[PDB]
């Protein structure tokens, strides 16, 4: 990244370098699956890929295992008269594991919330969410030189990292009967 070098060699060899790196990354992912379901019936939406496991255990157990790292909704809505639904919804966002692509032991990553909730049609709630706030500070210093105010910076090695990732899932049901009854 960044380096500043100052060198003397003829009188004395003194090489003084300052090496600094600053990184800022902002990533936003917005994924929305919409499923139309009949009342009291289960429906699913799935988008992703199913990693398989070749586990042909010889004595009669061929588990060509699989599991799809995918965005998915499994919904079982129950409609109440006052334009609300209590729905049991499994919401999964799973990303295909790198190690699987590595053909090693594949740890797929799953962010999934499964729960039953009551909402009006025009209303969205947070089925669940999680905020992960990482605050890391590291200071490395030779003690005598680190003590010096003007040279401590020149003798204190500072690494500060703040990584905060939050994931949240919302939901809103718009009854299609509003159109289906008129249709």
């Amino acid at each position: 990244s960044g380096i500043g070098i100052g060198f003397i060699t003829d009188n004395i060899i003194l090489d003084l370098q300052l090496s600094a790196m600053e990184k800022t990354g902002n990533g936003e992912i917005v994924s929305q699956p919409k499923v139309v379901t009949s009342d009291k019936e289960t429906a699913k939406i799935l988008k992703g890929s199913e990693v398989p496991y070749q586990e042909a255990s010889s004595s009669g157990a061929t588990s060509t295992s699989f599991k799809e790292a995918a965005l998915s909704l499994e919904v079982t809505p129950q409609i109440t008269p006052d334009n609300r639904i209590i729905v049991e919804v499994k919401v999964t966002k799973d990303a295909p594991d790198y190690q699987n692509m590595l053909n090693g032991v594949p740890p797929i990553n799953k962010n999934e919330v499964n729960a039953k909730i009551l909402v009006n049609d025009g209303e969205t709630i947070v089925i669940g969410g999680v905020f992960s706030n990482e605050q890391s500070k590291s200071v490395e210093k030779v003690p005598f030189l680190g003590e010096l105010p003007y040279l401590g910076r020149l003798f204190r090695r500072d690494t500060v990292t703040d990584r905060k990732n939050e994931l949240l899932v919302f939901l809103t049901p718009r009854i299609m009967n509003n159109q289906a009854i008129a249709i």
Binding site: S1, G2, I3, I5, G6, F7, I8, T9, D10, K23
Partner: protein
């Protein structure tokens, strides 16, 4: 050095020194180099992106 398309021509100067120019620097104020073929080849390939 950059990072999106990282570039630190100090090591490129090292590669050029491998090519064969004369670089002399006795103090930070004083330096000089001649017969440098590194820019036309090293920059062209490195910067091909």
């Amino acid at each position: 050095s950059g990072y999106g398309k990282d570039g630190n021509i100090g090591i490129k100067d090292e590669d050029g020194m491998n090519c064969g120019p004369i670089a002399g620097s006795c103090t930070f104020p004083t330096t000089g180099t001649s017969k440098s073929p590194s820019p036309f080849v090293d920059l062209g390939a490195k910067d091909a992106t």
